[PDB]
Every structure is written in structure tokens, then in C-alpha cells.
Design a protein around this ligand. Structure first.
Ligand SMILES: *[C@@](O)(c1nc2ccccc2s1)[C@H](C[C@@H]1CCNC1=O)NC(=O)[C@@H]1[C@@H]2[C@H](CN1C(=O)[C@@H](NS(C)(=O)=O)C(C)C)C2(C)C
Ligand SMILES: *[C@@](O)(c1nc2ccccc2s1)[C@H](C[C@@H]1CCNC1=O)NC(=O)[C@@H]1[C@@H]2[C@H](CN1C(=O)[C@@H](NS(C)(=O)=O)C(C)C)C2(C)C
Lengths: 299, 299
């Protein structure tokens, strides 16, 4: 079968603490003896319109930070400020720190999000970094600080840290070095994201997964060139397919015996004529949240 | 926002072992000093057409069972056979055994599945127990023994253990006492499941979640009685709505200010006239995989 899956969240639960700065309470990541968290923990619900995080960080001393690993208080001994995130050095090192790394995913790359509230893991779901650098996730108040991650067998790659919910209903945050994903800033303002395109490669890899799972009615006897299809897709707000993406689709093209350009033709007529009531993999829409690697992983 | 989420799989990863009986290798659940697993581990790929599990279990001694918790071999000291599952008592008790219970979910109830292969957790996704006692999950060879679970803060409720992939593409298994969910038997035969209905209450709770999230175009100025709507839905292969389900929808009806019967009217015209191209919560289909409790949990 073919489901939307997330990496096992186990290893990340062991790094989930509750950070507080006065009234404000948001989640933090405890890796080794450092606790990474959004810098807007030093803010009040009235110091959000436009806060100078440099002057706000002046008055805040180590004792203004309450890190609580479950029911056990860690001691903030030092505090740094990398980009939009705080970095509170603590006395104890995490005995549960797994083999980890800090990465920056690209538009189209998917990762699991362990949504936490008050330091407690609430649940896990999978999202892609939309080409407009936003995520269509599930966050409420107090979710800030929840992280996005992928796993390389032993190694947990961290790629996201939640910050805000944009006007259009979608979410935005940073990588683990504090740099925002996109043109966003950490302030309460009407800062809407641009127009969203569809990750073409991710839909082709989904149709490849669909063929592998038995749903193959959409398949036509046609072909098209990369120049031909790419120019057709561009009109429908689709991520321009490159020869790189074609190669990434390799193992799927091999498993299925269907050329990448043969698959682009079936998609081309699907864009021109619509799905007309029918369903692919039990979905009445063209799903782009699955990378070629996501599909291979489920085979 | 509104995503399909699974409970944090952490606590379950600590109970995931690799069980082997000759050539055959499938996953097992190590709770306290007992390892629960599907009884068809004692089978060969030629002893599946119709195997007498009583006579097959005769020749198999404790030393024919290789339980490997990661890289550490446990010692099978005793072996029982509750319904379709084996129960191998081991020397060491699991130091990571969480507060757990064994439950039997009902058609309509959803749970997280931690899909394991060779004792290793491969990933987690959420499914409901379809009214025809099958699950639309994601399983390959060696996935048998992967468990389905819900969490009550401290307490992990176990409700499923994978056994097979039915002809129609969907999966079927047992509860943790070995009893199959549905009319299925553990043998390799053409045993297709009946016609599937739609969990009406789960769609109403999804439209309630949709209203809470801003998508509310489907809402009409009409109403209907429980007798009226229920008889209309029955024609479209829908689970007959009971007054119990109406009460369960309570907190959602309260959050939204929309009566349960007002919501059934919008669904009634949606069934009669179709969605005509439009999308609710970014879905071009009526989604029934979310219980009222699933929706409350994300609020
Ligand atoms: C996050 O959990 C935080 N809450 C608080 C509360 C007080 C002080 C600091 C923080 S961080 C929260 C999560 C989002 C709430 C709605 N769903 C979420 O994902 N983040 C916010 O509320 C951020 C936060 C301030 C304002 N805010 C917003 O997202 C606002 N939208 S916006 C992008 O500014 O248009 C708000 C929801 C209208 C900052 C940006 C620091
Ligand atoms: C499960 O992992 C097992 N594999 C083996 C191999 C040897 C011995 C025992 C087992 S249990 C496996 C998982 C399914 C494979 C396809 N995707 C899955 O979810 N289960 C099976 O292969 C079961 C197993 C024997 C036959 N089988 C089937 O599902 C067959 N379909 S059926 C329901 O019999 O129509 C097969 C896929 C055609 C039993 C039932 C013991």
C-alpha cells in the first residue's frame, strides 16, 4: 500500500524540554549541554508588533530562563543568540542525545515534524518545504520550538524549528542555525508568502508509486520532450523539471519500466483534461508531498 | 491547520524486537518478560496454503526461536499460543516496558501504526479500523508483527498486530489477544473482505474541523432530522448515524455553534450534488479517517 509516513520520533522525544521566560512558555531542543529555542521566548504579547531582540535580551539574565526537562530543572549557565534562535548552555549534558546533525533542506524536501506543547510531544506528521518556503502543517499556540527532522539510520538530521502561523493559514520557521526559511521575519505583522507552485518531481514520483501499487488508469500511450512538458507545466504553476530530477526518478523508472518522459505525457494530459471524477491512490487530487526518496523508502 | 497525525512512537520503539523461527523473520512486541508475535512465524513459504498450527508448534522447541532485541539475544524459556499469536516468555524483562494495556478498538476507531521491519522501526502513520474490519495501511514483506497503538498520556493502549495483505490491496490483523479483526483466518487464500461503508460520524467531525480551520463554503442554510439524513446516507454506503455519535460530536458542535443536524444537511447536499471541483481542507474527497476525538486532540 501507500501511506504518508513520518520517521520514528523516538530519538527526538528524548531532546524535548520546556523553556520559559517570564509568562512566555515554548519548546526547546536539548542536544548535548545546549538548549536551542526560538528567540521570541524573551517577548511579551505586547512586545511582538516589532521587538528589538538585542535590547530585550539585555535585561534577561540566565535566571530569567526556566528549562524543565520533564520535571527536572536544568541550569542555564550561558546564553547566546544565533540569528532568530536562543542557545542556552546548561550544566547537565543530555544523556539521551542521539547521533545528530544540523542541515538546511531545499524547496521540495520533506521531513517529519514532532509537534510539541509545554515540552510534551503531542504527535508527528510529514510535510514538505513548499517552494515558497512555507509548510502546510498543524500548529496551535505554544507549538513554537517543535522541530522537523529526517533520519539516516543512526543519524537524526535536524532541519526546522517552528516560529509562526502566516495569515494565509500556513506556517513558517527557521533551520537549527536560526536562519528563516524564506523572506520571513519574527514579528507579528501581515507578511504573506508568495504564490505556491507544485513540486513537479514529487507528483511524478507519486504517479510512479501509484503504478507500483496497482492504480494505473491514468497511463497513456504518449511521450513528450523535457522542453515540451516543462513549458506546458509552467503555465499550471508547476516547478520546472530539470534533467537532475529526471535522474533522481531513476530507480522508480527502473522498477516500473516507464520512462520519465512517458510519465510526463500522462501527467500532461491529466493537467489539460483534469482527473474527471477518478482517483489515483485513493486521492482525487495530484499529490506533491512525496519525494522520489520517500517513495523508494516504501519499497 | 489540520494534518493527519500519529501518536509519538517513542515508547513503542523500546518494545520492538526481531523474532525468527528457521528461515522466517518477523517483528515482536516485548512487554515485561513476554514477546508477543504472529503465530505464522513457525511457517515455511510452502506451509501457508493451510497449516495446522497445532502440529507445526509440536516440533518447534524454545531453541527454534531467535529473539534479538537490537543486537542482544533474549532466551525463550516458555512458549504459549493464544488464538493467532505466539507468546514467548523470555528470561530478561524489558527495562523500557511502558505503562500499557491491551484493548479491542471498534469499527471507526483510529490508531497509530509503527511499521517495523527485521525488528527496526521503519516509520509511523495513522489509520482507522474500516467498518469491514480491514485497514488501508502501508505494509511490505516482513512487516508482520508491527503494532497499532493509542496513548492516554502515560498509558500506551495496544490494539493491533499485523498479519496479512488481502487481495483487494488492504491489510488485516489481530488485537493483542490474537483474535482476528474480522472474518479472516491466517492462511494464504483468496479471502476478500466485504463492501466498505463510510464512517459518517468521522466525516461530520472532519467537516467540523474544516469549519474550525476556515474552510466553510460547503455550509448551507438547511437542516434535516436524524431519520431523514440517516436514510439518505444509507443509500450512499454510509455508516448509519446514531444518537450516540451525535452526542460524541458535542464539543465540536459547541466550539462551532453548528447543530449536528445542521451539519448533516450540508453533507446531505454534498452527497446529492457532489463537491463539483472544490476542496475542503485541501482535499477533493470526503475524508472519514478522523474520529471526533482526533479532531478535539488538534484543538
Ligand atoms: C508560537 O507558539 C508562539 N507563541 C508565543 C506567545 C508569546 C510569545 C512568543 C510566542 S511564540 C506561536 C505559534 C503560532 C500560533 C498560531 N499557530 C502557530 O503556529 N507563534 C506565534 O503566535 C507567532 C509569534 C508572534 C506572532 N505569531 C504569529 O504567528 C502571528 N501571525 S503573523 C506570522 O505574525 O502574521 C499570530 C498567529 C497572528 C511571533 C512571530 C513571535
Ligand atoms: C508478513 O510480513 C509475513 N510474511 C511471512 C513470510 C513467511 C512466513 C510468514 C510470514 S508473515 C506478510 C505481510 C504482507 C506481505 C504483503 N504485504 C503484507 O502486509 N504477510 C503475508 O505475506 C501473509 C502471511 C501468509 C500469506 N500472506 C498474505 O498476505 C498473502 N495474501 S492472502 C491474505 O493470503 O490473500 C500474500 C501477500 C499473497 C500469512 C497469511 C500467514
Amino acid at each position: 500500500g501507500f501511506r504518508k509516513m513520518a520517521f520514528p520520533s523516538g530519538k527526538v522525544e528524548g531532546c524535548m524540554v520546556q523553556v520559559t521566560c517570564g509568562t512566555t512558555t515554548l519548546n526547546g531542543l536539548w542536544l548535548d549541554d545546549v538548549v536551542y529555542c526560538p528567540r521570541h521566548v524573551i517577548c511579551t504579547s505586547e512586545d511582538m508588533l516589532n521587538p528589538n531582540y538585542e535590547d530585550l535580551l539585555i535585561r534577561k539574565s540566565n535566571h530569567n530562563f526556566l528549562v524543565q526537562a520533564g520535571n527536572v530543572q536544568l541550569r542555564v549557565i550561558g546564553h547566546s543568540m544565533q540569528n532568530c534562535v536562543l542557545k542556552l548552555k546548561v550544566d547537565t549534558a543530555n544523556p539521551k542525545t542521539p547521533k545528530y546533525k544540523f542541515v538546511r533542506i531545499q524547496p521540495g524536501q520533506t521531513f517529519s515534524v514532532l509537534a510539541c506543547y509545554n515540552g510534551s510531544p503531542s504527535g508527528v506528521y510529514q510535510c514538505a518545504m513548499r517552494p515558497n518556503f512555507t509548510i502546510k502543517g498543524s500548529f496551535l499556540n505554544g507549538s513554537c520550538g517543535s522541530v522537523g527532522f529526517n533520519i539516516d539510520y543512526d543519524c537524526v538530521s535536524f532541519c526546522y524549528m517552528h516560529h509562526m502561523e502566516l495569515p494565509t493559514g500556513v506556517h513558517a520557521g527557521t533551520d537549527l542555525e536560526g536562519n528563516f526559511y524564506g523572506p520571513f521575519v519574527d514579528r507579528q505583522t501581515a507578511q504573506a508568502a508568495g504564490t505556491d507552485t507544485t513540486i513537479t518531481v514529487n507528483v511524478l514520483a507519486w504517479l510512479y508509486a501509484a503504478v507500483i501499487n496497482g492504480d494505473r488508469w491514468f497511463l497513456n500511450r504518449f511521450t513528450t520532450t523535457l522542453n515540451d512538458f516543462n513549458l506546458v507545466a509552467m503555465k499550471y504553476n508547476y516547478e520546472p523539471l530539470t534533467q537532475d530530477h529526471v535522474d533522481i526518478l531513476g530507480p522508480l523508472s527502473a522498477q516500473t519500466g516507464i520512462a520519465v518522459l512517458d510519465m510526463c505525457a500522462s501527467l500532461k494530459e491529466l493537467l489539460q483534461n483534469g482527473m474527471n471524477g477518478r482517483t489515483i491512490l485513493g486521492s482525487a487530487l495530484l499529490e506533491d508531498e512525496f519525494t522520489p526518496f520517500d517513495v523508494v523508502r516504501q519499497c
